[PDB]
Subunit: 380 residues, 4 copies
Amino acid sequence: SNKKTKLIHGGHTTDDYTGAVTTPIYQTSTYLQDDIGDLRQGYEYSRTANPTRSSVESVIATLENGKHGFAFSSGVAAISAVVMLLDKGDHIILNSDVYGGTARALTKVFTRFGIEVDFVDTTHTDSIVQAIRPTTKMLFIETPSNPLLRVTDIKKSAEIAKEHGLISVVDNTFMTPYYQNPLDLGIDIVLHSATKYLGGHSDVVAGLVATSDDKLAERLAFISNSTGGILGPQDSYLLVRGIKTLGLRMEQINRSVIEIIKMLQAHPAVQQVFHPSIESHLNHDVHMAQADGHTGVIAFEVKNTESAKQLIKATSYYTLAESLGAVESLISVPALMTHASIPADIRAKEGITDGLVRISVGIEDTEDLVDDLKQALDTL
Amino acid sequence: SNKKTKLIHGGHTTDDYTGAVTTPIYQTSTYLQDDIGDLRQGYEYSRTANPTRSSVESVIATLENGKHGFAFSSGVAAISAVVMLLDKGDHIILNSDVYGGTARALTKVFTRFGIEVDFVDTTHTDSIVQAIRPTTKMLFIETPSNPLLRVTDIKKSAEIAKEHGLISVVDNTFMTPYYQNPLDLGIDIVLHSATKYLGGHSDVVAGLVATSDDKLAERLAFISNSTGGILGPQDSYLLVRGIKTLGLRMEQINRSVIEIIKMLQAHPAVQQVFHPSIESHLNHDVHMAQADGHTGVIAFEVKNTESAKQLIKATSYYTLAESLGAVESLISVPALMTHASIPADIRAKEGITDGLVRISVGIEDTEDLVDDLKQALDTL
Amino acid sequence: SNKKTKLIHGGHTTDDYTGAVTTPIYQTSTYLQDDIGDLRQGYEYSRTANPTRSSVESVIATLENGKHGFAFSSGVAAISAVVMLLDKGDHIILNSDVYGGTARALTKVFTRFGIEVDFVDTTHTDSIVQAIRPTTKMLFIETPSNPLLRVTDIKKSAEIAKEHGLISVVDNTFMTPYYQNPLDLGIDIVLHSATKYLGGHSDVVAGLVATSDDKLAERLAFISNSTGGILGPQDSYLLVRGIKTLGLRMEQINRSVIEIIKMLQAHPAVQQVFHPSIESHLNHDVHMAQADGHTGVIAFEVKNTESAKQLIKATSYYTLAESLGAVESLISVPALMTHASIPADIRAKEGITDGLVRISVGIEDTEDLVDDLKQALDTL
Amino acid sequence: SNKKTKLIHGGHTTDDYTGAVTTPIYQTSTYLQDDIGDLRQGYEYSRTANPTRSSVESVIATLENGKHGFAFSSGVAAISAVVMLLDKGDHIILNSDVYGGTARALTKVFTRFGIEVDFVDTTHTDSIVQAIRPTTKMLFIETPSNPLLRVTDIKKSAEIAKEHGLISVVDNTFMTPYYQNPLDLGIDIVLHSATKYLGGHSDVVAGLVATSDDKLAERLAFISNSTGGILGPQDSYLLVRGIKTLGLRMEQINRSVIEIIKMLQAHPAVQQVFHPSIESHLNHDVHMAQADGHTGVIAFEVKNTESAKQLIKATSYYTLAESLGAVESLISVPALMTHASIPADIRAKEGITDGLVRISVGIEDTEDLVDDLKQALDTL
Ligand code: NA
Ligand code: NA
Ligand code: NA
Ligand code: NA
Ligand code: NA
Ligand code: NA
Ligand code: NA
Ligand code: NA
């Protein structure tokens, strides 16, 4: 019925054979055949299918109201699988500030295979309509984006994509299936870095893909079986286990996000704050129309580089590390850690100022996270 | 010094920190930074590098006398990584009977990205010289091949490749590093389905790549980090553990192979036998010059389909399943299980007769495997 | 600072060496010594100590405000370890309705070693004072108990134990460290079946023990090293990971418990309800004085056996299985599943009527659990 | 049929449900019941039984020609389980130089429960007959023993035990089921530290017990379920996997043992050598009559402490660590590492001289182990 219930009882995460209430870990590569071609339960070679991976795939399919799930060895492997639906000469539109790893994959790997890529500001959907070429076959959207959390209208992107015969894809990592279901809004394919919120415990690198399209599912399965970026059984198990608490975690993260944003907007040592919950944020109405909660990623400006470094070292409960979506709260400085190769004045142009801090809110006590960040800001 | 010693003491498979005599399993995605950019031991994000994966990579690099190792989520992911060294318009030569999954990847995935592929009979190396085009950039060789175990001269293929500016690649799965070291013979890149002999226990799907070329290594690392077909830490650990016994396993397998081949050549219900140890086999001299042992895969002809099915069901110690390189002995019928989509008369043309049986010799008692197969053959 | 924060940042659950933000899994048995007696980081043999087990032990010690943690292969192994602090001729007081496995261990195993055991109603602490013999050395208390949730005054039990020179022990499984800290109230030793709430995901059988007493800790360590009921590294890792969400899980469980109890008290097909939150419950004041939340175990009477079976099969979100403390809600009938060997009229005497149902509330949506149970009750 | 075959095909180590050729890892604690009391495949709570543990138990039972297997969290937990077959006032005979952990368990833990223990020189079996008291109920034998490898006649010990109504137990760790089967010679119970050869890779701490006695099996199962020293599923899986190569490993170890002993007997810097293969060894005939191979543990005298330390640091392929039975060769000095608490002159009395070195032969190349040890000895 309701979401927290569905997280527990949706999908196939028990053992039909023994009744084990958790998915068995099939640390195995091949399977007995009773006769040539007779598969006991459909399995014959773990790259093609493995029952633990199948359990996690059924989970992501159920949670996104899709029909088919796919588990890859990482988020970028999921993305490469999806991009491989295209041929040389095909063209793909991506939102202009898409994830750095996504941009790198497209422009430094797939353009060598004749995939053409255009980055557009999808915050106005007519931008998409202008960028459509006769060779465009895919529209690829993150919402909200990193690290400034730009929101893209998912439903309109889906309509545009259908009208022009495009495969629509949403990287739903930041929102998770708990808050935003792109397939329900007409999108062809939804994907996730399960490395982040879904696994939720910073201990699995994994990607997940869901679709309701039988033909797209068949092509994805062919690509996964032929290029082989499959998730292993132990990581699939840890993913299923982590997803059990997704709702509780995201709701705690959201309570802290609201309180932390109040604090940041009030504080003198903080200028601009980037988050879709702020009513002045571009397309705040749109986000509210397509999601019923918020991501735990916030960005905000302090004065300069050394204020940011001071902030990092003054906090007791914000940890300096890569990734987002941990049980710990994480802090980072994009201009030094993710956008450092970009020349400084294009960084400034894009809003990636030297004092832009990104935090990924964890599940610590709300008041502790507010107080710790505020006392650290008070030293600036 | 000697090979069985090197299998135990070569590579980094202990913990410098605690002294643990086995590699710790780093079931983790990200890493604390003491300062922005200060990595404690070089780690920052598990897709880029993970210390358990690093342990297995150092093992494959050491065992092939290379400098750089790479661990992928499967053999075909290793192969796709290597093929992605090429650009649209580039051309690759493969041996004509290359692994079905390899052929499928190249002709149904990578040709859509403008990679051109030509299959040649590399058992005569001048075939390679004839097939070279101005656009050829890669030469890809399995030796010996599946399921008829054709041998290709590795050293001459390396010389040819160097003279024409080609990246040379050997799929060394069937021989393993214990018996055949392509990098020692001038090959640029060696790869493995570690799913088979290296893991050795039918419980990991994985690929491994080694090279001595710094620039090729840098490009492989970039491709692995951007397309993300990485092996997880638990599977890397199981790989290291399985490789410990590789020498003992391969030597037992070889003792049984010699005895089983004597039996098969003597038996009336058996026609042709395919294995590089037979002195009448094409390029037997070449194989002996480039390897100091044998693969555990044998193929042999019985009369027809139902003799093969009878054989399978009469044996007590040969198991009907996909894959090769298990501790169990495995039996299969290519014409029904791996070449069934090919029309019957091209199957016959290629030697894939309806009675061609393939066995992958395991580590059971030699006399038991000889006796069990012979008594099963005696029922034909 | 606050509890949800302490769950994330308390204890040692990162890797000092690589910075890995999760505890490495040391799947290892022994450790290199640089010189005879020189242990690099204190490890020499995994039974004596293993760094993953050490991580989980530091977690349980921190969460109970103790000094020493111990991880055993199960709850009953923790209990046997603690009972082995005694010698033949020593006497132990346990609360009269203690866990069936505990009772069985004491009366069918340890009495054969000359341990004498007396069961008393500890809901009145003067019962303890009456039962003290000159040979009594241990007082062992669960609060609240299974399946009728009797509450025992922990602080008074501690005072009594200190005055008469007894080792006081509390089985704190049902409350978890999130809600009840016996060591803070003077108890010598606190233990847990981490199989239940702490692991929280029905995928680890494990026990945990914490103490602040150096001498008791030394004796426990000696017993653990000599009788060897240690938890393995993979299970220790899964325990640490599960404990991360303990607070969020228990708080969701508590919201549903309050609402479900309102429903049960209102429903006509339900007679008595057993839970310490009910103000009419014996020692409700005491529980509130020693805990700041509630267990997720509830018991309640329906009419008879077949009403209970009907109830079980009418619910969609209550699962029929052993154990408690899962993410799923669990349902059971003690008179058939845990007290079936007791004659029927002593069952009735004790309150274990044929219609007594026990539910362990999970983390599903509150309204779904209320509605599902109520609609199932409405069919009676 | 033959032993290497039985290691691969004996026991239940595949999945009946999916056909998976390796045992699934049931990382689970409890199991769905279709009706109260209806267990789908006999499982209801993982402490009582877990299907991965059941797989390893069936393996040890098959390999020792027993009927019932039991897997414990360590060797000493197996031993404590077996000792708990006794009651206060019962008396147990152990061989005089039994494992230090065994001696410590008996004399410092179980004597506090009224178990009486007598150490006798079982190398003459009439010693056993002299030590029998009216209260003796158990006879516990290691053969060969640590670190001087004394041999005890197993068959005569069994006859003696049966005639006087004693439960006979053999710690068969050093020989493994591959070479010595005590149950075949009349022994009631056989046990193993699977931490050593059976797991074989220094990455599992575990114990295994096998018996053919239904009543003893029922009592062991009751003790295991009530005191809870169970092996977890991941460790059970790693045990099954390690046992696959037991025969190949032990045979390599034995080839190196023979050659190393020739070297040691010839070398001037080496005095006495302790190993049952030497024809001058006490009860060499007896060992040959009850085993068809040898343990990989050897002890030998060098001059003094600093010759032993020099030896350790001169070898390249002998590793300084606790335990025995690794793939690596291990070296140790009992007088400093296992017998250091014993006063020096009783050490000398027992033969534990300051220059007594113990090596556990691994699976490195034979000639490398001979040459490395000899060149290290040549520096003395
Ligand atoms: Na939505
Ligand atoms: Na649709
Ligand atoms: Na070679
Ligand atoms: Na070279
Ligand atoms: Na408390
Ligand atoms: Na105290
Ligand atoms: Na024997
Ligand atoms: Na017998």
